[PDB]
Amino acid sequence: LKDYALEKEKVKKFLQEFYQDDELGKKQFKYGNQLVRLAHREQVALYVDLDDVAEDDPELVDSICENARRYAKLFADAVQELLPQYKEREVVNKDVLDVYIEHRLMMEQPAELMRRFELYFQGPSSNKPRVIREVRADSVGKLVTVRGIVTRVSEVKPKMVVATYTCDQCGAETYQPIQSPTFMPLIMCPSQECQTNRSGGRLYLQTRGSRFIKFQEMKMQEHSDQVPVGNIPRSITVLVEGENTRIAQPGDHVSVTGIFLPILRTGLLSETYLEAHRIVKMDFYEKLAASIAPEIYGHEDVKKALLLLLVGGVDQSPRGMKIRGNINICLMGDPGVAKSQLLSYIDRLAPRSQYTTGRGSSGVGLTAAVLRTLEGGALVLADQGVCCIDEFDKMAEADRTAIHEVMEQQTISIAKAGILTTLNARCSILAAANPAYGRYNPRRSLEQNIQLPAALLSRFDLLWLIQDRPDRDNDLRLAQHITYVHQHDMKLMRRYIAMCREKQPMVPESLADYITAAYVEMRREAWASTYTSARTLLAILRLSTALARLRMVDVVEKEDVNEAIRLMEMSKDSLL
Amino acid sequence: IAKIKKFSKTRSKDIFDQLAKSLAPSIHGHDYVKKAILCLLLGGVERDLENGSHIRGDINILLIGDPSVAKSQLLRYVLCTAPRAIPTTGRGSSGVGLTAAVTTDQETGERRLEAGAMVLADRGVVCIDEFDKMSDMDRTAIHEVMEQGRVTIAKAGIHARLNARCSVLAAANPVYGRYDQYKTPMENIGLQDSLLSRFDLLFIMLDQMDPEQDREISDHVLRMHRYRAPGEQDGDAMPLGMVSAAFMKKYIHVAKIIKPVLTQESATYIAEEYSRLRSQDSMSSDTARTSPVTARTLETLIRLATAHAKARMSKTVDLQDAEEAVELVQYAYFKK
Ligand SMILES: Nc1ncnc2c1ncn2[C@@H]1O[C@H](COP(=O)(O)OP(=O)(O)NP(=O)(O)O)[C@@H](O)[C@H]1O
Ligand SMILES: [Mg+2]
Ligand SMILES: [Zn+2]
């Protein structure tokens, strides 16, 4: 084996002499600068990069990659020995734990207690990432790189590093460094005075003196497309500690550098985990309307309705007499009609959204669920956005009541263990439904065709029947497009809706009077020709205010009401 | 390799017709069904779009008919002459058994998933006999698998999207047991119109009692019952416990690599013919058809033409392939 003293001096030489042609080629010696910041307590963790080491000594890099734990300890001791040379300044007292250390120094006048920094390796660029299936037992103890998806994360917990006790009789203190996942505490004083006199003094543990570190537990899983044919995906446990905590999130793609090790017992076969050293994450109105689903011919005003669904209205909030701004709409489709393309286009387009289907498949439902913590739910995962329901007509009573509760309160409840937990569901709803049998029949009402109950079905601001039928030129055009596809700016739109949705336009009393006259005349025609109700008025308000938000204007105007009126009026024509 | 090369190079006859004729020699008749089953064995091809969407390459087939018309035997034959094939019956299986079930490991003590029938058939075929006797709750499980080739599971601490890419071949019997001539196809068939829209082709089979046909059928059956294997002697009984089959397996196995491509003429033909077919369907009525014709018909035509080109090992999809494909679907949809 190597002489680790010689290796220590080599590591010191690297820290003392290396410059990356750094600070725009001024050769300011990056690690020397870092040691100054560390000495003056400006910074806690230090990521040493193995590509830098490779410039001087590739054999050292190879030495590190196998049995990495030795070199972790070695580099940490080297940094502690060199730190006073880069100090020039006295640091202000800022921590109770360090106030105890200061008192200890004042009274005196192990190193692990004082070592307030963290040292980690950034993997060499030679090492391509392995999949969770290729980290076999020949890699125990070696530095590895892995790629996958996060599934679960715990809260941050305090992990014990060194314990500090005080003695009732002799007034001394004792220390106990911790390394294994468990330990056994001290009881009676080992100091010479107490021992020689057998005076029996007891030891009291001090949470004001002992040292703790931030600790968090995580799980990571294989990508589905990487799994070989006819197999179930696997998972690996990752332990996060120190300044690496709170980076990762559930459902997020990550690449992790770490050491692969076996778990300590308390048989010859043992479980393993990955010790993390670094975590890396992987006019305007007509133009925007024409930008929605250009693959689909016609349906000009339906695209504008979906645009305003994405833009939204305003929450009025007059002292609890609430009117909400979220638009909600529903599409009734004939069998096999083009609605799937439009639906998926809005799903793809929207910056925050989710999709589900009403049949109640083997996966998790519309609401959250429990496993052995709470998780999931399409209604939950779309929150500051829009959620889309497919084949709505096949929903169950549980689904209908869940949608009803979301429409009223925009929140849900699921019982973890009998406790009445409750959970945010702030999103807008988009529904897709199909008639009970065959094509829609114009001789019968929409309730008779689609057969959802009228109470919740009438919640939607707009209802559209997507009916279509053969024609030679249109079918030929469609076939030409599909066969052509088989043979051979969203950023601006997102920024536009980002800036324009800052507006919350009001209405003046003149517009309220105008709306009053228009609404009563509309209801007169509605009963003379009924479906009209207060919901209709609030829908008009929502769509007109949404259009006012689409403009860069601080108030609604006559044209906004007129546009909303023709949109709600003409929607009936789709049913006939 | 040389045998398959010289055989395909001959080009004297339509090879696909010879291979289809030679399928399942014991079973007499049913030409179009044999041709469709051969297309299921060869398969289409996948394609992906720059928006992240993709086109399904595998084919699904359904058979409906009277008693004693050899529906079950065709399923038991495909199961023996295809790689990675699985059997299932409607009354004997559960949705959990079809997808995945939680298991307690006795070696480690841990809880983990175990694959069901449709997962094990990944990149293969699954045969469902007696399909009309399933509870609808199981059909809800089958829906996601047949549409998207994936199955979503949320059990034993795992939330996962498993792979279950497979072709479904299914058989059923009509309502009232014997098919009724005085009722429409949609009345005789017991299934929901939503589910019936997922299969690529649906065939109806009937025991038409013509003496002219009974003559050859009965003769063929009786010839089959007098055979004895050459390795067996005159009076023995067994203990309890045209293309050759070997060449057929090898030719199909090589043909599964070719990945042929569309041509402008075939695309033009399919588009024009689909428009013509749509106009004819618009004129026609539900009293004369099994189901409506839509974009799924174009996908079916493309898959079938691709498979026929694949059988030729011609790198192009040709006019001959498109013409064959449209004739097949025309027979399936527009015959009484
Ligand atoms: N054309 C045929 N060629 C060979 N055998 C045939 C033919 N037609 C019927 N059979 C016989 O029919 C018998 C029953 O076959 P089977 O596949 O069960 O029919 P089926 O249509 O599935 N009827 P069922 O299972 O009651 O719905 C077999 O023993 C075959 O020998
Ligand atoms: Mg049978
Ligand atoms: Zn003491």
PDB file of N, CA, C and O in Angstrom, chain A residues 152 221 224 229-230 232-233 348 359 361-364 371-372 375 391 394 437-438 469-470 472 475-476 479-480 483 485-488, chain B residues 47 49 51 55 111 122-123 143-144 151-152 154 156-159 161-163 165 192-194 262-264 267 271 274-275 278 302:
ATOM      1  N   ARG A 152     -39.383   9.664  -4.001  1.00  0.00           N
ATOM      2  CA  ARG A 152     -39.774  10.133  -2.670  1.00  0.00           C
ATOM      3  C   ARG A 152     -38.602  10.825  -1.983  1.00  0.00           C
ATOM      4  O   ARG A 152     -37.439  10.547  -2.279  1.00  0.00           O
ATOM      5  N   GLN A 221     -35.371   5.921  -9.265  1.00  0.00           N
ATOM      6  CA  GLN A 221     -35.914   4.803 -10.046  1.00  0.00           C
ATOM      7  C   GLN A 221     -35.492   4.874 -11.517  1.00  0.00           C
ATOM      8  O   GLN A 221     -35.206   5.951 -12.046  1.00  0.00           O
ATOM      9  N   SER A 224     -38.430   4.344 -17.691  1.00  0.00           N
ATOM     10  CA  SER A 224     -39.199   3.245 -18.273  1.00  0.00           C
ATOM     11  C   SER A 224     -38.628   2.803 -19.619  1.00  0.00           C
ATOM     12  O   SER A 224     -38.581   1.602 -19.909  1.00  0.00           O
ATOM     13  N   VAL A 229     -37.082  -5.649 -22.403  1.00  0.00           N
ATOM     14  CA  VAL A 229     -38.430  -6.127 -22.743  1.00  0.00           C
ATOM     15  C   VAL A 229     -38.944  -7.121 -21.708  1.00  0.00           C
ATOM     16  O   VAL A 229     -38.240  -8.053 -21.306  1.00  0.00           O
ATOM     17  N   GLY A 230     -40.189  -6.919 -21.282  1.00  0.00           N
ATOM     18  CA  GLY A 230     -40.837  -7.790 -20.309  1.00  0.00           C
ATOM     19  C   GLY A 230     -40.246  -7.796 -18.908  1.00  0.00           C
ATOM     20  O   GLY A 230     -40.070  -8.878 -18.333  1.00  0.00           O
ATOM     21  N   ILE A 232     -39.762  -5.430 -14.884  1.00  0.00           N
ATOM     22  CA  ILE A 232     -40.272  -4.456 -13.910  1.00  0.00           C
ATOM     23  C   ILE A 232     -39.117  -3.528 -13.515  1.00  0.00           C
ATOM     24  O   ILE A 232     -38.018  -4.026 -13.238  1.00  0.00           O
ATOM     25  N   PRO A 233     -39.311  -2.194 -13.454  1.00  0.00           N
ATOM     26  CA  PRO A 233     -38.178  -1.302 -13.123  1.00  0.00           C
ATOM     27  C   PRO A 233     -37.741  -1.375 -11.659  1.00  0.00           C
ATOM     28  O   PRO A 233     -38.542  -1.636 -10.759  1.00  0.00           O
ATOM     29  N   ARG A 348     -50.283  19.823 -24.596  1.00  0.00           N
ATOM     30  CA  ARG A 348     -48.880  20.077 -24.921  1.00  0.00           C
ATOM     31  C   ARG A 348     -48.521  21.552 -24.739  1.00  0.00           C
ATOM     32  O   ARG A 348     -47.431  21.886 -24.262  1.00  0.00           O
ATOM     33  N   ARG A 359     -62.403   6.306 -17.067  1.00  0.00           N
ATOM     34  CA  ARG A 359     -62.716   4.890 -16.868  1.00  0.00           C
ATOM     35  C   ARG A 359     -62.206   4.325 -15.542  1.00  0.00           C
ATOM     36  O   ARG A 359     -62.559   3.193 -15.199  1.00  0.00           O
ATOM     37  N   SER A 361     -58.842   3.669 -14.417  1.00  0.00           N
ATOM     38  CA  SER A 361     -57.840   2.662 -14.752  1.00  0.00           C
ATOM     39  C   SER A 361     -57.071   2.185 -13.507  1.00  0.00           C
ATOM     40  O   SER A 361     -57.235   2.699 -12.398  1.00  0.00           O
ATOM     41  N   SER A 362     -56.210   1.177 -13.720  1.00  0.00           N
ATOM     42  CA  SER A 362     -55.478   0.519 -12.631  1.00  0.00           C
ATOM     43  C   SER A 362     -54.507   1.444 -11.889  1.00  0.00           C
ATOM     44  O   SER A 362     -54.045   1.082 -10.800  1.00  0.00           O
ATOM     45  N   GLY A 363     -54.170   2.609 -12.447  1.00  0.00           N
ATOM     46  CA  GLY A 363     -53.288   3.564 -11.793  1.00  0.00           C
ATOM     47  C   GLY A 363     -53.995   4.384 -10.717  1.00  0.00           C
ATOM     48  O   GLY A 363     -55.085   4.053 -10.250  1.00  0.00           O
ATOM     49  N   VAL A 364     -53.335   5.479 -10.310  1.00  0.00           N
ATOM     50  CA  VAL A 364     -53.901   6.380  -9.299  1.00  0.00           C
ATOM     51  C   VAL A 364     -55.021   7.229  -9.910  1.00  0.00           C
ATOM     52  O   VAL A 364     -55.039   7.508 -11.117  1.00  0.00           O
ATOM     53  N   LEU A 371     -49.959   5.178   0.077  1.00  0.00           N
ATOM     54  CA  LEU A 371     -49.102   4.020  -0.171  1.00  0.00           C
ATOM     55  C   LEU A 371     -48.261   3.706   1.061  1.00  0.00           C
ATOM     56  O   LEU A 371     -48.066   4.550   1.940  1.00  0.00           O
ATOM     57  N   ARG A 372     -47.760   2.469   1.102  1.00  0.00           N
ATOM     58  CA  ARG A 372     -46.941   1.966   2.211  1.00  0.00           C
ATOM     59  C   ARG A 372     -45.730   1.204   1.672  1.00  0.00           C
ATOM     60  O   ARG A 372     -45.864   0.313   0.834  1.00  0.00           O
ATOM     61  N   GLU A 375     -49.831  10.804  -1.781  1.00  0.00           N
ATOM     62  CA  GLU A 375     -49.241  11.217  -3.053  1.00  0.00           C
ATOM     63  C   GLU A 375     -50.298  11.342  -4.149  1.00  0.00           C
ATOM     64  O   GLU A 375     -51.442  10.907  -3.994  1.00  0.00           O
ATOM     65  N   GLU A 391     -63.139  11.232 -21.802  1.00  0.00           N
ATOM     66  CA  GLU A 391     -64.260  10.291 -21.673  1.00  0.00           C
ATOM     67  C   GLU A 391     -64.962  10.482 -20.325  1.00  0.00           C
ATOM     68  O   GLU A 391     -65.210   9.536 -19.572  1.00  0.00           O
ATOM     69  N   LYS A 394     -67.909   8.373 -18.715  1.00  0.00           N
ATOM     70  CA  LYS A 394     -67.705   7.086 -18.049  1.00  0.00           C
ATOM     71  C   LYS A 394     -67.306   7.217 -16.576  1.00  0.00           C
ATOM     72  O   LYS A 394     -66.970   6.208 -15.945  1.00  0.00           O
ATOM     73  N   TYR A 437     -74.890   6.438 -27.090  1.00  0.00           N
ATOM     74  CA  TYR A 437     -74.919   5.526 -28.233  1.00  0.00           C
ATOM     75  C   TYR A 437     -74.713   6.314 -29.521  1.00  0.00           C
ATOM     76  O   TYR A 437     -75.432   7.285 -29.774  1.00  0.00           O
ATOM     77  N   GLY A 438     -73.747   5.885 -30.333  1.00  0.00           N
ATOM     78  CA  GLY A 438     -73.530   6.378 -31.691  1.00  0.00           C
ATOM     79  C   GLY A 438     -73.315   7.878 -31.787  1.00  0.00           C
ATOM     80  O   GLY A 438     -72.750   8.524 -30.899  1.00  0.00           O
ATOM     81  N   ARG A 469     -68.571  15.021 -40.451  1.00  0.00           N
ATOM     82  CA  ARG A 469     -69.076  13.983 -41.346  1.00  0.00           C
ATOM     83  C   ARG A 469     -68.259  13.975 -42.638  1.00  0.00           C
ATOM     84  O   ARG A 469     -67.538  14.938 -42.924  1.00  0.00           O
ATOM     85  N   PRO A 470     -68.348  12.895 -43.443  1.00  0.00           N
ATOM     86  CA  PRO A 470     -67.508  12.794 -44.653  1.00  0.00           C
ATOM     87  C   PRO A 470     -67.765  13.872 -45.702  1.00  0.00           C
ATOM     88  O   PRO A 470     -68.875  14.387 -45.844  1.00  0.00           O
ATOM     89  N   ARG A 472     -65.681  14.618 -49.840  1.00  0.00           N
ATOM     90  CA  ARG A 472     -64.601  14.120 -50.696  1.00  0.00           C
ATOM     91  C   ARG A 472     -63.347  14.986 -50.596  1.00  0.00           C
ATOM     92  O   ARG A 472     -62.246  14.470 -50.372  1.00  0.00           O
ATOM     93  N   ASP A 475     -61.913  15.029 -46.840  1.00  0.00           N
ATOM     94  CA  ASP A 475     -61.305  13.739 -46.527  1.00  0.00           C
ATOM     95  C   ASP A 475     -60.028  13.525 -47.329  1.00  0.00           C
ATOM     96  O   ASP A 475     -59.052  12.972 -46.811  1.00  0.00           O
ATOM     97  N   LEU A 476     -60.012  13.947 -48.596  1.00  0.00           N
ATOM     98  CA  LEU A 476     -58.800  13.819 -49.398  1.00  0.00           C
ATOM     99  C   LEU A 476     -57.677  14.689 -48.843  1.00  0.00           C
ATOM    100  O   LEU A 476     -56.518  14.267 -48.802  1.00  0.00           O
ATOM    101  N   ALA A 479     -56.406  12.970 -45.701  1.00  0.00           N
ATOM    102  CA  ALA A 479     -55.631  11.786 -46.054  1.00  0.00           C
ATOM    103  C   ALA A 479     -54.274  12.170 -46.628  1.00  0.00           C
ATOM    104  O   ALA A 479     -53.259  11.530 -46.328  1.00  0.00           O
ATOM    105  N   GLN A 480     -54.239  13.205 -47.473  1.00  0.00           N
ATOM    106  CA  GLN A 480     -52.976  13.693 -48.015  1.00  0.00           C
ATOM    107  C   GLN A 480     -52.048  14.150 -46.899  1.00  0.00           C
ATOM    108  O   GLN A 480     -50.856  13.830 -46.901  1.00  0.00           O
ATOM    109  N   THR A 483     -50.872  10.948 -44.811  1.00  0.00           N
ATOM    110  CA  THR A 483     -49.903  10.149 -45.563  1.00  0.00           C
ATOM    111  C   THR A 483     -48.595  10.909 -45.772  1.00  0.00           C
ATOM    112  O   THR A 483     -47.520  10.300 -45.761  1.00  0.00           O
ATOM    113  N   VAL A 485     -47.306  13.106 -43.648  1.00  0.00           N
ATOM    114  CA  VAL A 485     -46.630  13.028 -42.352  1.00  0.00           C
ATOM    115  C   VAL A 485     -45.994  11.654 -42.167  1.00  0.00           C
ATOM    116  O   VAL A 485     -44.874  11.537 -41.652  1.00  0.00           O
ATOM    117  N   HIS A 486     -46.694  10.593 -42.578  1.00  0.00           N
ATOM    118  CA  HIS A 486     -46.140   9.248 -42.417  1.00  0.00           C
ATOM    119  C   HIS A 486     -45.010   8.958 -43.411  1.00  0.00           C
ATOM    120  O   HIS A 486     -44.134   8.135 -43.120  1.00  0.00           O
ATOM    121  N   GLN A 487     -45.014   9.604 -44.583  1.00  0.00           N
ATOM    122  CA  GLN A 487     -43.989   9.354 -45.601  1.00  0.00           C
ATOM    123  C   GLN A 487     -42.683  10.095 -45.314  1.00  0.00           C
ATOM    124  O   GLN A 487     -41.601   9.553 -45.568  1.00  0.00           O
ATOM    125  N   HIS A 488     -42.761  11.327 -44.803  1.00  0.00           N
ATOM    126  CA  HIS A 488     -41.580  12.186 -44.613  1.00  0.00           C
ATOM    127  C   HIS A 488     -41.224  12.373 -43.141  1.00  0.00           C
ATOM    128  O   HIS A 488     -40.415  11.626 -42.591  1.00  0.00           O
TER     129      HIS A 488
ATOM    130  N   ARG B  47     -43.724   4.519 -35.907  1.00  0.00           N
ATOM    131  CA  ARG B  47     -43.172   5.798 -36.352  1.00  0.00           C
ATOM    132  C   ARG B  47     -43.392   6.847 -35.265  1.00  0.00           C
ATOM    133  O   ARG B  47     -44.377   6.787 -34.521  1.00  0.00           O
ATOM    134  N   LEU B  49     -43.093  11.212 -34.147  1.00  0.00           N
ATOM    135  CA  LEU B  49     -43.269  12.575 -34.646  1.00  0.00           C
ATOM    136  C   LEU B  49     -42.519  13.575 -33.764  1.00  0.00           C
ATOM    137  O   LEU B  49     -42.337  13.355 -32.563  1.00  0.00           O
ATOM    138  N   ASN B  51     -43.237  16.293 -32.419  1.00  0.00           N
ATOM    139  CA  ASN B  51     -43.979  16.796 -31.262  1.00  0.00           C
ATOM    140  C   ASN B  51     -43.994  15.814 -30.084  1.00  0.00           C
ATOM    141  O   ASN B  51     -44.569  16.139 -29.039  1.00  0.00           O
ATOM    142  N   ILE B  55     -46.991   6.455 -33.547  1.00  0.00           N
ATOM    143  CA  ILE B  55     -48.006   5.668 -34.256  1.00  0.00           C
ATOM    144  C   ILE B  55     -47.839   4.196 -33.868  1.00  0.00           C
ATOM    145  O   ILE B  55     -46.730   3.653 -33.929  1.00  0.00           O
ATOM    146  N   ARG B 111     -41.662  -6.600  -0.195  1.00  0.00           N
ATOM    147  CA  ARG B 111     -42.849  -6.577  -1.063  1.00  0.00           C
ATOM    148  C   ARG B 111     -42.503  -6.001  -2.438  1.00  0.00           C
ATOM    149  O   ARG B 111     -41.912  -4.920  -2.523  1.00  0.00           O
ATOM    150  N   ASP B 122     -45.075  -8.880 -23.742  1.00  0.00           N
ATOM    151  CA  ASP B 122     -44.406  -7.718 -24.327  1.00  0.00           C
ATOM    152  C   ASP B 122     -43.577  -8.104 -25.557  1.00  0.00           C
ATOM    153  O   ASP B 122     -42.807  -9.066 -25.530  1.00  0.00           O
ATOM    154  N   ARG B 123     -43.752  -7.332 -26.638  1.00  0.00           N
ATOM    155  CA  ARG B 123     -43.209  -7.636 -27.978  1.00  0.00           C
ATOM    156  C   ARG B 123     -43.635  -9.029 -28.468  1.00  0.00           C
ATOM    157  O   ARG B 123     -42.873  -9.715 -29.156  1.00  0.00           O
ATOM    158  N   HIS B 143     -58.424  -1.975 -21.929  1.00  0.00           N
ATOM    159  CA  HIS B 143     -58.536  -0.774 -22.769  1.00  0.00           C
ATOM    160  C   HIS B 143     -57.207  -0.019 -22.887  1.00  0.00           C
ATOM    161  O   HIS B 143     -56.749   0.287 -23.999  1.00  0.00           O
ATOM    162  N   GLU B 144     -56.581   0.297 -21.745  1.00  0.00           N
ATOM    163  CA  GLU B 144     -55.330   1.058 -21.748  1.00  0.00           C
ATOM    164  C   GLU B 144     -54.222   0.304 -22.486  1.00  0.00           C
ATOM    165  O   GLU B 144     -53.469   0.901 -23.271  1.00  0.00           O
ATOM    166  N   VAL B 151     -49.130   0.116 -19.207  1.00  0.00           N
ATOM    167  CA  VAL B 151     -50.097  -0.116 -18.129  1.00  0.00           C
ATOM    168  C   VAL B 151     -49.614   0.596 -16.868  1.00  0.00           C
ATOM    169  O   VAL B 151     -48.472   0.408 -16.439  1.00  0.00           O
ATOM    170  N   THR B 152     -50.489   1.422 -16.284  1.00  0.00           N
ATOM    171  CA  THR B 152     -50.164   2.249 -15.120  1.00  0.00           C
ATOM    172  C   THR B 152     -50.545   1.541 -13.819  1.00  0.00           C
ATOM    173  O   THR B 152     -51.688   1.098 -13.666  1.00  0.00           O
ATOM    174  N   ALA B 154     -50.070   1.571  -9.333  1.00  0.00           N
ATOM    175  CA  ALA B 154     -49.862   2.413  -8.141  1.00  0.00           C
ATOM    176  C   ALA B 154     -49.964   1.599  -6.837  1.00  0.00           C
ATOM    177  O   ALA B 154     -50.832   1.842  -6.003  1.00  0.00           O
ATOM    178  N   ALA B 156     -47.792  -1.159  -3.727  1.00  0.00           N
ATOM    179  CA  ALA B 156     -46.576  -1.621  -3.030  1.00  0.00           C
ATOM    180  C   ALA B 156     -45.479  -0.551  -2.996  1.00  0.00           C
ATOM    181  O   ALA B 156     -44.288  -0.853  -3.124  1.00  0.00           O
ATOM    182  N   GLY B 157     -45.879   0.708  -2.812  1.00  0.00           N
ATOM    183  CA  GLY B 157     -44.947   1.821  -2.759  1.00  0.00           C
ATOM    184  C   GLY B 157     -44.347   2.239  -4.084  1.00  0.00           C
ATOM    185  O   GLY B 157     -43.441   3.079  -4.090  1.00  0.00           O
ATOM    186  N   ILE B 158     -44.827   1.689  -5.201  1.00  0.00           N
ATOM    187  CA  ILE B 158     -44.295   1.958  -6.537  1.00  0.00           C
ATOM    188  C   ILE B 158     -45.397   2.603  -7.372  1.00  0.00           C
ATOM    189  O   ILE B 158     -46.523   2.095  -7.426  1.00  0.00           O
ATOM    190  N   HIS B 159     -45.061   3.715  -8.028  1.00  0.00           N
ATOM    191  CA  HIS B 159     -45.896   4.360  -9.039  1.00  0.00           C
ATOM    192  C   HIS B 159     -45.132   4.220 -10.349  1.00  0.00           C
ATOM    193  O   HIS B 159     -44.069   4.830 -10.508  1.00  0.00           O
ATOM    194  N   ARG B 161     -45.097   3.026 -14.841  1.00  0.00           N
ATOM    195  CA  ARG B 161     -45.671   2.885 -16.180  1.00  0.00           C
ATOM    196  C   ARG B 161     -44.943   1.723 -16.867  1.00  0.00           C
ATOM    197  O   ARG B 161     -43.899   1.914 -17.492  1.00  0.00           O
ATOM    198  N   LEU B 162     -45.496   0.515 -16.739  1.00  0.00           N
ATOM    199  CA  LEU B 162     -44.857  -0.689 -17.274  1.00  0.00           C
ATOM    200  C   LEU B 162     -45.080  -0.824 -18.784  1.00  0.00           C
ATOM    201  O   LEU B 162     -45.987  -0.220 -19.362  1.00  0.00           O
ATOM    202  N   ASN B 163     -44.236  -1.649 -19.419  1.00  0.00           N
ATOM    203  CA  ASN B 163     -44.297  -1.910 -20.861  1.00  0.00           C
ATOM    204  C   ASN B 163     -45.068  -3.199 -21.143  1.00  0.00           C
ATOM    205  O   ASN B 163     -44.743  -4.253 -20.589  1.00  0.00           O
ATOM    206  N   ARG B 165     -46.367  -4.028 -24.706  1.00  0.00           N
ATOM    207  CA  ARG B 165     -46.612  -3.898 -26.146  1.00  0.00           C
ATOM    208  C   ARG B 165     -46.949  -5.271 -26.724  1.00  0.00           C
ATOM    209  O   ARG B 165     -46.069  -6.132 -26.815  1.00  0.00           O
ATOM    210  N   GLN B 192     -69.698  -3.435 -26.509  1.00  0.00           N
ATOM    211  CA  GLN B 192     -69.916  -1.992 -26.585  1.00  0.00           C
ATOM    212  C   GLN B 192     -69.270  -1.397 -27.835  1.00  0.00           C
ATOM    213  O   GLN B 192     -68.223  -1.864 -28.291  1.00  0.00           O
ATOM    214  N   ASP B 193     -69.895  -0.345 -28.382  1.00  0.00           N
ATOM    215  CA  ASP B 193     -69.374   0.263 -29.609  1.00  0.00           C
ATOM    216  C   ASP B 193     -68.020   0.939 -29.385  1.00  0.00           C
ATOM    217  O   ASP B 193     -67.217   1.037 -30.321  1.00  0.00           O
ATOM    218  N   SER B 194     -67.748   1.407 -28.162  1.00  0.00           N
ATOM    219  CA  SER B 194     -66.435   1.971 -27.847  1.00  0.00           C
ATOM    220  C   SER B 194     -65.331   0.924 -27.977  1.00  0.00           C
ATOM    221  O   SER B 194     -64.277   1.186 -28.566  1.00  0.00           O
ATOM    222  N   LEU B 262     -42.890   3.955 -47.269  1.00  0.00           N
ATOM    223  CA  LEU B 262     -43.918   4.417 -48.210  1.00  0.00           C
ATOM    224  C   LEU B 262     -43.328   4.920 -49.525  1.00  0.00           C
ATOM    225  O   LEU B 262     -42.171   5.347 -49.596  1.00  0.00           O
ATOM    226  N   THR B 263     -44.166   4.892 -50.569  1.00  0.00           N
ATOM    227  CA  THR B 263     -43.895   5.487 -51.873  1.00  0.00           C
ATOM    228  C   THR B 263     -44.992   6.494 -52.198  1.00  0.00           C
ATOM    229  O   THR B 263     -46.117   6.385 -51.701  1.00  0.00           O
ATOM    230  N   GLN B 264     -44.653   7.482 -53.036  1.00  0.00           N
ATOM    231  CA  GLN B 264     -45.615   8.522 -53.397  1.00  0.00           C
ATOM    232  C   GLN B 264     -46.843   7.929 -54.082  1.00  0.00           C
ATOM    233  O   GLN B 264     -47.972   8.364 -53.839  1.00  0.00           O
ATOM    234  N   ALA B 267     -48.994   6.109 -51.400  1.00  0.00           N
ATOM    235  CA  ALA B 267     -49.644   7.132 -50.585  1.00  0.00           C
ATOM    236  C   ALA B 267     -50.791   7.796 -51.343  1.00  0.00           C
ATOM    237  O   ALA B 267     -51.886   7.989 -50.797  1.00  0.00           O
ATOM    238  N   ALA B 271     -54.760   7.587 -50.343  1.00  0.00           N
ATOM    239  CA  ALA B 271     -55.531   8.801 -50.079  1.00  0.00           C
ATOM    240  C   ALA B 271     -56.768   8.885 -50.973  1.00  0.00           C
ATOM    241  O   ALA B 271     -57.891   9.105 -50.488  1.00  0.00           O
ATOM    242  N   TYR B 274     -59.260   6.102 -50.097  1.00  0.00           N
ATOM    243  CA  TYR B 274     -59.931   6.395 -48.834  1.00  0.00           C
ATOM    244  C   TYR B 274     -61.020   7.441 -49.022  1.00  0.00           C
ATOM    245  O   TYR B 274     -62.089   7.346 -48.416  1.00  0.00           O
ATOM    246  N   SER B 275     -60.758   8.466 -49.840  1.00  0.00           N
ATOM    247  CA  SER B 275     -61.809   9.447 -50.112  1.00  0.00           C
ATOM    248  C   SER B 275     -62.996   8.800 -50.828  1.00  0.00           C
ATOM    249  O   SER B 275     -64.161   9.071 -50.495  1.00  0.00           O
ATOM    250  N   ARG B 278     -64.850   6.724 -48.267  1.00  0.00           N
ATOM    251  CA  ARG B 278     -65.611   7.596 -47.376  1.00  0.00           C
ATOM    252  C   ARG B 278     -66.897   8.076 -48.038  1.00  0.00           C
ATOM    253  O   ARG B 278     -67.947   8.144 -47.391  1.00  0.00           O
ATOM    254  N   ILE B 302     -52.408   1.489 -43.831  1.00  0.00           N
ATOM    255  CA  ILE B 302     -50.958   1.679 -43.832  1.00  0.00           C
ATOM    256  C   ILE B 302     -50.261   0.474 -43.198  1.00  0.00           C
ATOM    257  O   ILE B 302     -49.272  -0.037 -43.741  1.00  0.00           O
TER     258      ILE B 302
END
